């Protein structure tokens, strides 16, 4: 499960790891705070003018992924 040494080897011998576990492998290794309050206060303010706009330079035609 967790432990940088176990993961270092697991991710080398198994190779990578599956997606459903990104939360645990990363959060452990990356010391994430899971600071959900801080994140949510970024998520809801309103219109953001710098990136309305993205397909103009990176035209990936997915209206849900660009979102």
């Amino acid at each position: 499960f967790l432990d940088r040494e176990k993961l270092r080897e697991f991710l080398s011998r198994f190779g990578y790891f599956p997606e459903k576990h990104r939360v645990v492998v990363w959060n452990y290794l990356l010391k994430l705070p899971s600071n959900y309050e801080a994140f949510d206060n970024l998520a809801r303010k309103g219109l953001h003018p710098n990136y309305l706009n993205l397909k103009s330079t990176f035209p990936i035609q997915s209206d849900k992924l660009y979102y």
Binding site: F1, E9, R13, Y36, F39, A43
Partner: protein, 41 residues
């Protein structure tokens, strides 16, 4: 022989255990996963 299979076999056991990391995820960190849903709305 060892590098082939003794290792490949012992390296099975990596997922044998990693297959359940989600069982903690849902009970490790979940208080946040959960709090966020309200705090968001």
């Amino acid at each position: 022989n060892i590098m082939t299979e003794a290792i490949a076999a012992s390296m099975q056991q990596i997922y044998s255990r990693l297959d359940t990391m989600f069982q903690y995820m849902t009970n490790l960190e979940n208080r946040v996963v959960q709090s966020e849903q309200l705090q968001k709305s």
